[PDB]
Amino acid sequence: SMITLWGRNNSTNVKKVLWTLEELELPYDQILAGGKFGVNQDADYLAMNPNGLVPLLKDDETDLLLWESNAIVRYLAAQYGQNRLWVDNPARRAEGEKWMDWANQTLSPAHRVILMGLVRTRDQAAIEAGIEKCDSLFALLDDALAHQPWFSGDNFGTGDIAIAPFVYNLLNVGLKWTPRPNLQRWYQQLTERPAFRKVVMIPVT
């Protein structure tokens, strides 16, 4: 295929890209990379991504080699998702896109505490503190969804793609949270999307 994706399936950031590719019905070749798969710390990979992280996406059609999951999602949307996942109007686009930055700058670090502490390990305090932080972030997201159906606004979009893989993990590590009805309604609509069920709804490991 013209598109190559490096990354493992149990990565939030890789999931964003796999999910976008599936939503847009784009063909791609996956190369397992990260963790016990290696590849991502090889000299040849570091020449493509000096951070040595996944995902990495190559698009031979546009001579593109791109890292940063959110940039990859926005690229795929603009290039292949016109009138589907790309919002043309800058202001309406921004209202959704802010949630991409927020997903990685605010939600991800709180999520990391839980995924590390519970799944891939423990420090009662640490974790309990991360749970409180995530519960508070869930309150914020619940309010954000009080008057619109999607983080991207009127329609499902790239803000929703950025946030949901983290939320998926947090709702599947045996924890029970304060009920958040707007957030839960939103999550249910994601579970109805075949691409989400395929890519995101897999075991937490």
Place this chain on the structure above:
Amino acid sequence: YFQSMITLWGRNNSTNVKKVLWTLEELELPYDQILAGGKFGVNQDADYLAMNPNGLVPLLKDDETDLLLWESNAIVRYLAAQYGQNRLWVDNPARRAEGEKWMDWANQTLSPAHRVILMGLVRTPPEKRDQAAIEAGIEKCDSLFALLDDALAHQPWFSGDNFGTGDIAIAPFVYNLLNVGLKWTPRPNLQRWYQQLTERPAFRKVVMIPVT
């Protein structure tokens, strides 16, 4: 009554606010600033939290487009696409992405390392400094500078052929790090780029102010 269509909330010594001030100045857009953050308050008021539940700055209102927007990088990309076509916005998705990745990286990778140093040397007195943490922050930032130096080996700007929003995202952090009394391993491509920035009137106006 001398009021503008764009309102910006935030204090001048914030990296994230600087990105937006700098963009507004590059595009020669009129704006009204409302000081907010730190000792200025405003950002934890109920009225402000209703606009930005994170209670952080910057926040930008654009009355022309009925927009109320937080996240500095999203604000910069908005201004570029709306007001900076053929100046700061790169139309081609792939060529745009090559620059825009550096916006994500600035805030996800550079910012946390910068934060250690800014908090430690600028906003903590010597008697309370964690010298170990600062030294580790310095090591980390020196390694990130090596990465940025290599990235600039074969192109003039993070945004590619021309100055752009990837450059805007990275530079305010680099400015602080170069103005806190530290000497770094030389990085010739990074230094050449930084000098380029110092020749831009909007950068001199907004970014090149005292580190406090």
